[PDB]
């Protein structure tokens, strides 16, 4: 009876911007990954550290579901060791990522005539992210040496710029909804498996 | 980010064992998501892959070479190594250590792994010769509006000589030329900076010659001619 | 195993679209991932296209890669061609036995202006005249097309001895550079009033002349 709330994260309603990438832990639960193979509606489905055909019968100490919205070009950067605008200042995977990466198109739902501006991303950060770090600050990026003083000014940018999401866009600049499932291998009891 | 810097002898007398080492920074070599390879480039000719390795020991080899190839992960010191034995002149090449794209599985479960290189090293140069390293004697090319001075890096073996200027703080107007190979089978390049006439009497000019295969580190004042 | 055949040389105007093909001789091209690497001269390669149509980050949007199953080709498309793209382009695919690279496509951008070489000729340094070597350094630079012919002359009379010229190499600015050295023993450097460097690019001669102090 206790399915892992997967329609809660996948089917869902609102997703987060990638700078404020949303995360759900699911403890004490059996997980139906069967409804994720036989789907076909995923454009990319990558799995790092484990085959997903194996996934219905290992035991893990928790799984985290990370989820967000990015352009279709930026999905590649949702991978171990990818360089990039999303990987560095928005959402970094560890290089030793056990887990999987699931993404699909959402123009019929997220791309609005006139421009759905409502999703956005970090253009500018001082340091890169640590894996699974989350950055929320609206602190003005000091792009030059001339200081910023909290004002959007000379060499001083608001570090978050928008996605402008028209449904008329190219295959690159679409809106995509991504779900990252990570699997921690703790030296600890299993709370989530599936048989 | 992910920097990849090689380590090579520059010289491998023939029929012997060439060892290269690829020091890695900004990433775990112990990660089983990636693979780690060597690509060589014999000079003025195309590229070929040698071997690739992940940390589990699972290991792929070019079969024209596989007989002579060994590879391993030096996981304490975060670096990995190419051992190529019984080398010949056909193993003269620039050797690139590189890092593949991440090993993953599709939703059907087919395993995609070691298929192409994401991040490259700078390369290291290996010349196979029955001889040994010769340090460069180095000489100033003093100037005679716009004005050009320089360094000569005379008689060295093998490639490379790397040269920078005022400990690398001057790069602008620096042009370092490709070396000639003379009849002697040795090498000579020259390295010229174009600067204003104003900075002749005041602003000092050290070029920093470094021939890695012979430990040879050499600086030199280029100061102008008089009457 | 299989071959990957690339055309050796392509030439296209700036701004126009060029496409480098990559023809697998054996096996269907859509069964393995195709990677494209660029190599500027004397530079390490960098990945421009992986997984047939993806790019890593920092590769411009004008790089695309595609597949044709009809000609069994992978294509790399550079659209809006720059001054600065002038490179060797290697396609690579694999299978679980060996990787295979293509032989190289040297791409050349047309319409770049021709350029008369800057020629700089240096005497032997006084540090080098003791220990008894006298090398004259002639530095030919900023020329295009990359085809020069160096002559040397003692006094005003042809040197035919001691000259070792490097074949011209492509610079950062896509013009070409070479150098020509003349090793003399110090008697020869003393026993002439002048030495001269005749670099002849497209039938015009640039004089630079050098004497002892
Ligand atoms: C979302 O709804 C579809 C409707 O066909 C259903 O099949 C699917 O299982 C749901 N998603 C999840 C993750 O349960």
Author numbering:
A (entry chain A): 333 to 527
B (entry chain H): 1 to 35, 35A, 35B, 36 to 82, 82A, 82B, 82C, 83 to 100, ...
C (entry chain L): 1 to 26, 27A, 27B, 28 to 66, 66A, 66B, 67 to 210
The study reports:
Here, we report the isolation of three mAbs that broadly neutralize sarbecoviruses. All three antibodies recognized epitopes within the receptor binding domain (RBD) and inhibited the binding of soluble human angiotensin converting enzyme 2 (ACE2) receptor to the S protein. All three antibodies recognized a region on the inner side of RBD that is hidden in the RBD-down conformation. Thus, they can only recognize RBD in the up conformation.
Given the binding breadth exhibited by 10-40, we conducted additional structural studies for this mAb to investigate the basis for its cross-reactivity. To this end, we determined crystal structures of the 10-40 Fab bound to the RBDs of the sarbecoviruses SHC014, RaTG13, and WIV1 at 2.2 Å, 2.8 Å, and 3.1 Å resolutions, respectively. These structures demonstrated that 10-40 bound to a highly conserved epitope that allowed for similar binding of 10-40 to these sarbecoviruses and SARS-CoV-2. As observed in the complex of 10-40 bound to SARS-CoV-2 RBD, the majority of interactions for 10-40 with SHC014, RaTG13, and WIV1 were through its CDRH3 and CDRL2. We found that additional hydrogen bonds and salt bridges were present between 10-40 and these three sarbecoviruses as compared to SARS-CoV-2. Specifically, though the 10-40-SARS-CoV-2 interface involved 10 hydrogen bonds and three salt bridges, there were 15, 14, and 17 hydrogen bonds and four, three, and three salt bridges for 10-40 with SHC014, RaTG13, and WIV1, respectively. These additional contacts may explain why the potency for 10-40 against SHC014, RaTG13, and WIV1 is greater than that for SARS-CoV-2. Among the four complexes of 10-40 with sarbecovirus RBDs, there were a total of 12 interactions (nine hydrogen bonds and three salt bridges) that were conserved in all of the complexes. Such extensive overlap suggests that for mAbs that have deficiencies against some of these sarbecoviruses, engineering of similar interactions could help to improve their breadth.
